[PDB]
């Protein structure tokens, strides 16, 4: 009747310590009558520990010294098991009963971790493997908004087979100035570049390269940045709007229609790449009053502090009852999968 | 030096007895100079099964009667590790040094088993993780064909939400009659109904829910049935094109010119989805002479009487020839990969 919640967290990312801190911030809240936490840790190398509630991180208590207690108590899976699916290299683990996993990091988010989970019969917390691959590749995502009459920047993608041809006078005569370049998966912070006159383009196009095979190359986009939290499978609900001031405004300053109107997109949008669980959707609110999609994100942050639970707890879902109702969609969706 | 190939084929599908075959002709093709194979099969019920080459299958000769040989040799996968990442439950496997995936089946090929591989930093043959994904939604597919301005079939797409509120006589004044109905994930064969009047839809629809959660009604299209293999990374190269006679005839009686521009629309179509190592485009070649795209399926058969391999034995590569270079592409994204 507890049902055990597999916690997969860390994960090869600059978000590895965002990560750990969303794991306690999960742990504490977890309600102690519906669920009992089993642990797992991935390493900024790759590899995964299974560790006690009591003993899973170094330094806990100073952001600056926080890592993962790497115990060195390996995971083995189980491919098409059907019950023990997660197994110690060495002798006995609870039997898991849904993964929640918040690993940061290429494989942890764009589908490849779901895809493990689904090859061990694990229900799992978040975006299945289309939904989360394709909001993963920037690219994809954007094709596919602008698929679905969704508005979004303006933008080129090379990969560098055609990086090499760029042309910045062509690119600066349909996309403007400044540029952002950006590699397409990943390409928040990591391998990005704002370029202000043509000159600093060839840079900006090498670097995002170095982190990407593919690299788009967007417009700019004036207007006020809007978030909004996302929650459910078939029938999405959307959470208050929070305001970007440059540093969350919740709730935003501006009218119930611009809100209602930034909601109705954010659904929209999450439908289209086909997310489930939760996403955080970030729009551009124009002069105007035109709403453009910036990024639909399937892993947002988790820790207390973090915009997506605060969306929610100011839509009055607090943290404790936002992470039960995620490990429901993940055990609805294994249900209705299971007579698929 | 020799590299070992790790196949692994069968699958819960109905095409398992074709991956059987598939698994058998690779294996007798595979260069002994090159590659060693190792043998992991899934079960109709999703449990693999490590196989010695002289024995894993029952009834090899008898196509009434092949079967796996259930040896309960059992496999775990080592997520995160980087050597020997799979390993016997029980004493040793060959490390792996590239899998070849054959496995039909939900999970085999949309994305689930790649995730997995990618997990164990296996390089393998064929699409990634988005790709896979991608292809196998056939919703998510048209849309994205639709976004890179390909032709395909007028089409709408329910879930079970939005099902009970379909109109026959709306989809029938916007796409025509016969109406194709199958299931978006899977639908070539199951679940799938030509419906000729709207008396039969609202069972074809019902049928088609019953596999997956989203459905597609599309128009009819009216043209010759051609088919194209592809195969490449980052430049893909196009076969010569056969013709289906409702039965394939290589290569097609069609135009060079036509030719040329079905081969061109093929490598667009895999470039636009995220296609890698290999994949067979369908289309219609209408009247008039528009080429429309049916289908695109990253993972063919590998039979000797399969399509895909006999497109390219028409173009001048080899069976042997063939199997080497998706081996060979396998293993260029995987080291690609490894520097970003």
Redesign the interface.
Known sequence: RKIRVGLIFGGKSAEHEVSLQSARNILDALDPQRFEPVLIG??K????HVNDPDSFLLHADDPARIALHRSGR????????QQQQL?P?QQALAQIDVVFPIVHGT?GE???????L??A?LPFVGSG??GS??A??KD?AK??L???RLAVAPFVCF???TAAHADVDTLIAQLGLPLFVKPANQGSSVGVSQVRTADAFAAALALAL????KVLVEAAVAGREIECAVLGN??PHASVCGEVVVEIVIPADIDAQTQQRIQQIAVQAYQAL?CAGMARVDVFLCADGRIVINEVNTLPGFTRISVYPKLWQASGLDYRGLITRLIELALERHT?DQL?
Chains 1, 2 share one sequence.
């Open positions: 991935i390493d190398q790759g590899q995964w390996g995971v083995a899976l189980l491919p098409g098991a197994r290299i494989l764009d589908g490849s971790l779901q895809g493990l689904r090859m019969n493997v289309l691959a394709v993963m590749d994809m094709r596919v602008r698929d679905a990969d560098r087979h170095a982190y990407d095979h078939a029938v086909g209705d698929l």
